Each structure stands twice: as C-alpha cells, then as structure tokens.
Amino acid sequence: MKRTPLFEKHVELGAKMVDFAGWEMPLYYTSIFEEVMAVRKSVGMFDVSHMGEFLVKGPEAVSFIDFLITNDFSSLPDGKAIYSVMCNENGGIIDDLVVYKVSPDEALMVVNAANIEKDFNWIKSHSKNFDVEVSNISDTTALIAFQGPKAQETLQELVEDGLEEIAYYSFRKSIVAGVETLVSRTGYTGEDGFELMLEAKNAPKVWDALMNLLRKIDGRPAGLGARDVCRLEATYLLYGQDMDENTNPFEVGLSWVVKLNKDFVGKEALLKAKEKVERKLVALELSGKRIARKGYEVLKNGERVGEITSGNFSPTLGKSIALALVSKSVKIGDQLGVVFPGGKLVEALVVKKPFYRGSVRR
Ligand SMILES: Nc1nc2c(c(=O)[nH]1)N(C=O)[C@@H](CNc1ccc(C(=O)N[C@@H](CCC(=O)O)C(=O)O)cc1)CN2
Numbered sequence: 001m002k003r004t005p006l007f008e009k010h011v012e013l014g015a016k017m018v019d020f021a022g023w024e025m026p027l028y029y030t031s032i033f034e035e036v037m038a039v040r041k042s043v044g045m046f047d048v049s050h051m052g053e054f055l056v057k058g059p060e061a062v063s064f065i066d067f068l069i070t071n072d073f074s075s076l077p078d079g080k081a082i083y084s085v086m087c088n089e090n091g092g093i094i095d096d097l098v099v100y101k102v103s104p105d106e107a108l109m110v111v112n113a114a115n116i117e118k119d120f121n122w123i124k125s126h127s128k129n130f131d132v133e134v135s136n137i138s139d140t141t142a143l144i145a146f147q148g149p150k151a152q153e154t155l156q157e158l159v160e161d162g163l164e165e166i167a168y169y170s171f172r173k174s175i176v177a178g179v180e181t182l183v184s185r186t187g188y189t190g191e192d193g194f195e196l197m198l199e200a201k202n203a204p205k206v207w208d209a210l211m212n213l214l215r216k217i218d219g220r221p222a223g224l225g226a227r228d229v230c231r232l233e234a235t236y237l238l239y240g241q242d243m244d245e246n247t248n249p250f251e252v253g254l255s256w257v258v259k260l261n262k263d264f265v266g267k268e269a270l271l272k273a274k275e276k277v278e279r280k281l282v283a284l285e286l287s288g289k290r291i292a293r294k295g296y297e298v299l300k301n302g303e304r305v306g307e308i309t310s311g312n313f314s315p316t317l318g319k320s321i322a323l324a325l326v327s328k329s330v331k332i333g334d335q336l337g338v339v340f341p342g343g344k345l346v347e348a349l350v351v352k353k354p355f356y357r358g359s360v361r362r
C-alpha cells in the first residue's frame with residue numbers, strides 16, 4: 001500500500017491501520033467516537049496527504065478552470081477557494097473538488113485520493129486549447145486538516161499571520177511551525193477549521209508541533225473513521241459512494257455548484273438534465289443500531305424507490321444515519337424501509353438535510 005509522509009507517526013501513535021484507496025491509513029487512534037467528539041468539541045487533526053493536488057499555470061488558468069468545472073470561477077478573486085464538481089460530456093460527475101484561485105496565472109486543484117489518475121488524465125486531455133500547463137504535485141505534497149470549534153485558537157500560536165483575517169473558503173501562503181504552508185479556512189467536518197498544504201518533507205515537523213498543542217486542549221489526532229462520520233453528519237458528499245459518473249449534479253443536491261449561464265464541459269447535457277430531475281439524495285435516520293451499506297434497497301410501503309449510498313452511526317445525534325438516492329416522489333417525513341442482507345427490513349425516516357451543522361462560517 002501507498003504510505004503518506006506521516007505513516008510512521010500513525011504507527012508510533014498505535015493507530016489501527018486500514019487500506020483506503022490503496023493507502024495504508026489510520027482508521028482511528030483511540031476510537032471513532034472519541035475522535036468524532038474531539039472534532040465536535042475541541043479539535044481533531046487528520047492526515048489527508050493521500051488527496052491529490054494539481055497545479056494549473058499559465059495566462060489562461062482562469063478560463064481553463066472555468067471550462068472544466070461547473071461552478072463559476074471566471075470572477076473568483078485572488079485568495080478565494082471554491083467547491084465544485086467536474087462533469088463529462090454527458091453531465092455525469094467525474095469528481096468533486098476544491099479549486100484555489102492563487103492568481104490569474106495560477107490555480108490549485110485538490111481532488112480525492114482514488115481519482116488522482118483519472119482526474120489528471122481528464123484535465124490534461126482538455127488543456128489543448130488553453131495557454132496553460134497542468135502538473136501533478138501530489139507525489140511531493142502533504143495535507144493536514146485541523147478541524148473543530150477550537151481549531152483557530154489552538155493553531156494560531158504556530159502561524160506567523162493572523163488566522164482571523166482568513167475567511168471561509170479563502171486562503172493565504174504563510175508559515176506554520178517554521179515551514180511554508182498554504183493555510184485555508186476549509187474542511188470536510190461541518191465545524192470551523194483549516195487545511196494545511198505543505199511539502200511532504202515538512203509534514204512530520206508540523207504534525208509533531210500540532211500534536212503537542214492538541215494534548216494541551218484535550219484535542220485528538222483523528223482517523224478516517226471519524227472523517228467519514230463527521231462528513232456524513234455534515235451531509236457533505238463522498239465521491240464514489242454518494243455520486244459518480246452515473247449521477248448528474250442535480251440528482252445529488254449539488255445544483256448550487258452548477259452555473260448554466262456559463263460554458264463548460266457537460267453544459268448542454270446538464271441543461272436538458274435540469275428539465276427532468278427524476279432522482280434526489282435524501283437523508284435517512286434509521287431505527288436501531290445497524291448501519292446501512294451502499295446498495296441496500298430502499299422501499300416505501302413495499303415498493304422500491306431507490307438505494308442507500310452512504311451509512312454510518314452518528315454519535316452526535318446518537319442515531320444510525322444514511323444518504324440514499326431515491327425517486328423524486330420521496331419527501332421529508334416519509335416512512336421508508338431499508339432492506340438489510342437476508343431480506344430484513346429496517347425502518348427509516350426521511351429528515352431535512354443536513355443532519356448537523358457545527359461551528360462552520362462564510
Ligand atoms: N481542500 C479539500 N479538497 C477536497 C476535499 C477536502 O476535504 N478538502 N474532498 C474531500 O473529500 C473532496 C471534495 N468533497 C467535499 C465536499 C463538500 C465540501 C464542503 O466544504 N462543502 C460546504 C461548502 C460550502 C461553500 O463552498 O461555501 C457545504 O456543502 O456546505 C468540501 C469538500 C475533494 N477535494
């Protein structure tokens with residue numbers, strides 16, 4: 001398996017290692033619950049160095065990105081980041097991502113671990129008619145997520161610049177624990193927080209400095225187990241589970257990141273798709289402690305309406321929760337049934353999204 005620059009730190013910390021997208025990563029250090037609560041109460045630190053980063057350099061970096069992604073990048077000012085999806089010609093979602101507008105001549109793309117290769121090939125095969133150069137810097141880049149209501153106050157003493165000046169989905173090049181770091185007020189937890197992008201060689205030092213501070217305020221290093229729980233609670237999507245090329249953005253609640261008033265890959269297909277949205281992604285709260293898995297069929301009074309996409313147990317709400325792709329006819333309040341292996345029906349209630357929202361801003 002691939003190992004991030006912090007692998008040794010995780011092992012030394014006694015974490016339970018698991019295989020995620022071909023990466024040897026920590027599922028948890030102490031327990032998933034304890035780590036989720038650290039994220040919800042103080043601060044949880046995640047090693048997300050398996051994520052990929054692409055660099056787009058050149059006079060036409062802006063127009064190129066605006067052509068590739070569904071969201072409006074054409075006017076995004078310097079220092080701003082933006083969440084979006086990238087679609088194929090048929091409007092299917094290739095991946096979701098975060099793009100940083102460094103300057104008119106430079107943009108950074110952060111994508112999911114499992115799709116680095118796919119994404120990079122897609123982006124490069126589309127740069128032909130743009131004055132840009134696309135490069136993959138994943139192999140030498142590390143990324144740490146410092147999330148929680150106490151994230152800012154704990155991290156500040158290691159940063160040479162004031163964090164308050166960094167707005168939600170904004171960033172700035174600075175120095176953290178003595179090393180060059182791109183600090184952005186972003187996250188995948190629903191709490192306030194930051195992500196620290198830096199050269200892989202400096203990952204160990206920054207992580208150790210941060211660990212020293214966590215212990216001071218009862219914070220915790222957090223693994224992928226907690227990462228999934230918190231993102232599900234926050235109701236953020238996980239590519240490959242909640243959406244893929246077989247779903248367009250409108251079907252999974254991402255209509256807000258699609259600006260049809262501009263030209264981009266998948267534009268025409270999405271115009272027609274918008275006219276007939278037959279599916280929707282709903283939030284479910286199941287009865288009991290069993291956790292639903294992707295693929296489990298979802299029924300309404302005996303009739304199939306869709307299937308589970310993501311599932312997990314939420315210690316924040318103390319309930320088994322899930323996301324499900326169902327027909328447009330399903331509505332909040334509906335009593336549905338989830339078919340577990342062996343034909344066992346588990347009751348589920350459709351609730352309003354999101355499940356939970358913490359200390360997050362804009
Ligand atoms: N920098 C970064 N890039 C990344 C991730 C990440 O965690 N961090 N991802 C990790 O899997 C994937 C994208 N998944 C994500 C899904 C939702 C949100 C998110 O913050 N959604 C807020 C956005 C609010 C706004 O733009 O104003 C929301 O839906 O409310 C972020 C990443 C790929 N790229």
Ligand SMILES: Nc1nc2c(c(=O)[nH]1)N(C=O)[C@@H](CNc1ccc(C(=O)N[C@@H](CCC(=O)O)C(=O)O)cc1)CN2
Binds near residue numbers: 106160173
């Ligand atoms: N005291 C001091 N402060 C300083 C600097 C310095 O040299 N000394 N810097 C001097 O410049 C900046 C901090 N250093 C940084 C330089 C680059 C990146 C950065 O954006 N790195 C990207 C590079 C790849 C890309 O842009 O595509 C990355 O982390 O991947 C972050 C911090 C601002 N403050």
